[PDB]
Each structure stands twice: as C-alpha cells, then as structure tokens.
C-alpha cells in the first residue's frame, strides 16, 4: 500500500501493487509474437518495392 493515509493524491498516482505474475507472462508472450511479426512485416515492406 504505497500511499500515506489521509493525504492528497493526484490523478494517475499508483496506490497498490497487485503482484501481476500472469499479466507479465502473457505480456511477454505477446511481446515475443510482436517481436517476430514486426520483422516479418518489415522485410516484406523492403521487398515489395522491388516486386520480389
């Protein structure tokens, strides 16, 4: 609980930490899938100019 009680908080200030451990995991999996298909799209972008 990372706030002193009875204080004034602003918008977007973090209040708790709910120990992600699954959201981090499928974030890693989606990050790996994006880190494949980004190069897969970039090489096709370079190739499509030469009509290969």
């Amino acid at each position: 609980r990372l706030f002193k009680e009875g204080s004034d908080v602003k918008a977007g200030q973090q209040l708790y930490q709910i120990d992600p451990a699954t959201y981090e995991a499928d974030y890693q999996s989606a990050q790996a899938n994006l880190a494949s298909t980004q190069e897969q799209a970039q090489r096709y972008k370079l190739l499509v100019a030469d009509q290969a």
């Binding site: 190069e39 090489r43 190739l47 030469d50 009509q51 290969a52």
Partner: protein
C-alpha cells in the same frame, strides 16, 4: 537452300534463348534480394543461381 533456312531461323532462335537467359537472370536477382533481406535461406538462392547458368 538449307543454309538460307538456317540463316532465317537461327537469329530468332538465339534471340529467344537470350530472352530466356535474361528472364532467368532477373529471377536470380530478385531471389538474391529476397535472400539478403533475410526472407529465404541459401538453398533456394543456390537453385536459382544454378538455373541461371
């Protein structure tokens, strides 16, 4: 007459062969670009290089 027939045919047959050679060369050049961008492996570059000569 056979010599005149060979003269009338060979200049077009060699032109067809030259067009075939340059089509294979354009194929090899596109395959080389597709290799060096990283899309394909060296084997399907080497087979096109082989078909070229």
């Amino acid at each position: 007459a056979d010599g005149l027939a060979a003269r009338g045919t060979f200049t077009e047959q060699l032109q067809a062969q030259r067009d075939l050679v340059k089509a294979s060369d354009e194929y090899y050049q596109l395959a080389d670009k597709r290799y060096r961008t990283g899309v394909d492996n060296y084997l399907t570059l080497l087979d096109a290089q082989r078909s070229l000569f």
